[PDB]
Write a protein that binds this ligand. Structure first.
Ligand SMILES: [Ca+2]
Ligand SMILES: [Ca+2]
Lengths: 37, 300
């Protein structure tokens, strides 16, 4: 039923983050990354 | 955040009933006093944000709030007030009696425990929703904005069943360049995103237009999970390759057509929200031109 998915566009090719632990990190980071601006 | 022309007196808001156990906070229905200079008390929708929320959700919350402050469309949930003075914070919006479209749809399913006692949306009703949402989207694009998160779960259904846009956490400004490009890592609605957005992280009105199509598919299928049976990974590959969802059983040929249009692989073949509303103008409830942005003078 989930809705959002963790991805990464840094780099020539698109990408739905595959590692459970890495993808789960995206959340917090997209947040900080925005703080800066 | 910092106060402004909205920030309403908390003592003017009373919380009656709860309408959604959000994770970032919640959604309550209540009554207000002296909001619309002219009316004593008016019943509203109140979206709260947990004091101890997500470093990420917070921002996406204010964005939503802020962005709304500039809108004025019969088809775009109206903002009424804000309250940053003491946790929890509040965003007073017009009450959409029937909840979010996803839930409203999911409740038309015959198997539904919380069924409303009526059948699923009929071709007419669909065309209606289609054009209203389309309109709301049209307006949105006009005020130079790309939604990025169009989906039934973000549309609201009013008491009289008018559908409107109601979540704006992912919306972005495009007045400048007419598009948004996702920088690095982030969380995105893959199952509602267009090939190019999937491929290059670029969001345009056409991508929203593509989502629009998906929303039609959600409606015509009572909110099924798009590309159900496909892994997030698989969905990317499948859609980037030129894949699209299948028409649900008994799907109005006419709505199917609309989807074939929204799912054109080449963004420039996809229609505009206005071309859509126009393509429908003839078969809608009469009270449409009075309220519609499309028929409004602001459209020029
Ligand atoms: Ca939001
Ligand atoms: Ca949201």
């Amino acid at each position: 039923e989930n809705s959002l998915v963790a991805m990464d566009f840094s780099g020539q090719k698109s990408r739905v983050i595959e590692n459970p632990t890495e993808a789960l990190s995206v959340a917090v980071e997209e947040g900080l990354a925005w703080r800066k601006k | 955040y910092v106060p402004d022309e909205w920030e309403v007196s908390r003592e003017k808001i009373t919380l009656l009933r709860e309408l959604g156990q959000g994770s970032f906070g919640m959604v309550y229905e209540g009554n207000a006093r002296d909001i619309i200079k002219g009316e004593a008390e008016t019943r509203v929708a109140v979206k709260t944000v947990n004091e101890s929320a997500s470093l990420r959700e917070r921002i996406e919350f204010l964005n939503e709030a802020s962005v709304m402050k500039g809108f004025t469309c019969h088809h775009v949930v109206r903002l009424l007030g804000v309250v940053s003075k003491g946790q929890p914070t509040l965003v007073v919006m017009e009450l959409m009696a029937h909840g979010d479209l996803k839930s409203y749809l999911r409740s038309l399913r015959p198997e539904a425990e919380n069924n409303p006692g009526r059948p699923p949306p009929t071709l007419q009703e669909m065309i209606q929703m289609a054009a209203e949402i389309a309109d709301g989207m049209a307006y949105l694009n006009a005020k130079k904005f790309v939604h990025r998160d169009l989906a039934a779960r973000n549309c609201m259904v009013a008491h009289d069943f008018t559908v409107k846009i109601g979540d704006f956490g992912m919306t972005r400004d495009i007045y400048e360049t007419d598009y948004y490009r996702k920088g690095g890592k982030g969380l995105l609605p893959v199952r509602w995103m267009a090939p190019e957005s999937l491929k290059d992280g670029v969001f345009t009105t056409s991508s929203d237009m593509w989502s629009f199509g998906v929303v039609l598919w959600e409606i015509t299928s009572l909110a099924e999970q798009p590309y159900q049976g496909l892994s997030n990974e698989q969905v990317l590959k499948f859609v980037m390759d030129g894949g699209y969802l299948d028409q649900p059983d008994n799907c109005p040929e006419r709505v199917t057509d609309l989807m074939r249009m929204c799912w054109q692989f080449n963004p420039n073949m996809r229609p505009t929200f206005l071309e859509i509303v126009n393509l429908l103008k003839d078969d809608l409830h009469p009270s449409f031109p009075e309220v519609s942005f499309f028929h409004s003078e602001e459209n020029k």
